[PDB]
């Protein structure tokens, strides 16, 4: 079984742990319980082969920690989960996005954007805003909901699919990017 290091990030109150518990234990939470160090590992089957998903939860209510940089560096897949019912969460993504870049020491990493609480009438952030945003950074966006449990499984499968193609792409492109450029005359 292939092991995958998955790390989730996001602001506090977006329903980060809600997604994990709803996907792993298949249960829902209602109590606002802040997480510090949660470890969820489930054995599933993605694209035929057995896939062991190792997800490490984060603390939404925390500042810059050296210990956070440690386990975040061990993560290969990053999921930016935010609630579209809060403008702060949409802006906070920029902080985390740049943070991950520094931690992984790479400007290009496997990250997926997810707008939780999409079934709530408090949706202030429009899908178009997220679509345009994600498009500008070359990342995908999923309208996941823990309450409805829709788009949950696929959101995680998306990361694995991109990671597989990423590792494969590494040996295909070879950090070449482009060849030669020439203008007219």
């Amino acid at each position: 079984m292939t092991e995958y290091k998955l790390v989730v990030v996001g602001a506090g109150g977006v329903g980060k742990s809600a997604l994990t518990i709803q996907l792993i234990q298949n249960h829902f939470v209602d109590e606002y319980d802040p997480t510090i160090e949660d470890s969820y590992r489930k054995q599933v089957v993605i694209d035929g082969e057995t896939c062991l998903l190792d997800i490490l939860d984060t603390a939404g209510q925390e500042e810059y920690s050296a210990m956070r940089d440690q386990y975040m560096r061990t993560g290969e897949g990053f999921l930016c989960v935010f609630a579209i019912n809060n403008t702060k969460s949409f802006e906070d993504i920029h902080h985390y996005r740049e943070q991950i870049k520094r931690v992984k020491d790479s400007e290009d990493v496997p990250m997926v954007l997810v707008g939780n609480k999409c079934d709530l009438p408090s949706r202030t952030v429009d899908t178009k805003q997220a679509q345009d945003l994600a498009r500008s950074y070359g990342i995908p966006f999923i309208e996941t909901s823990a309450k409805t449990r829709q788009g949950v499984d696929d959101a995680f499968y998306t990361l694995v699919r991109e990671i597989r193609k990423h590792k494969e792409k590494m040996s295909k492109d070879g950090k070449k990017k482009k060849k030669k450029s020439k203008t007219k005359c």
Binding site: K180, S181, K182, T183, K184
Partner: protein
Amino acid sequence: LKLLDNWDSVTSTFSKLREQLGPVTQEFWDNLEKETEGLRQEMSKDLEEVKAKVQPYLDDFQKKWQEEMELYRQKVEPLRAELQEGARQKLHELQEKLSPLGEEMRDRARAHVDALRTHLAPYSDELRQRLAARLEALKENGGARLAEYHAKATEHLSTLSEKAKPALEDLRQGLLPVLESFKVSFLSALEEYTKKLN
């Protein structure tokens, strides 16, 4: 600006559609509510009467089914008896044949196989003699074929050498300037691509 401008036109259309979507869903949901409302009142007929009338319906069919089950049970008893008594007689009748004719079949099989063994006895030995001649014929001839094949192969290898050395050399030496000129055309073609497509 080609794709950007064309896209912008689509963006305006999408934005316009959004302003239409609202009234559309608002009116559609209003009409849908009328549809569901009617169905809600119809539910007080469809489901209500289906459940109210289901009682006499089910009771009737169930009562009849019970009678059918009763009749089936009252018939299955004596009928199964005839079936069993008849089966016993039919099976016993078969047994009365399976025993004597069965033993006879075994005895006949003894002779059937006896004749087979007795006939196959000299046959198998003769087959061994046949095989011996068959194999030896292919052995004596085989040695000749192998010898000839080796000779033919060697002669084929010498002629193959004329292809591997003289022919191949000329082919390579001939293809050399061809590949060189090919590279030239390919180089210019590369430029053509970048000069027109970039």
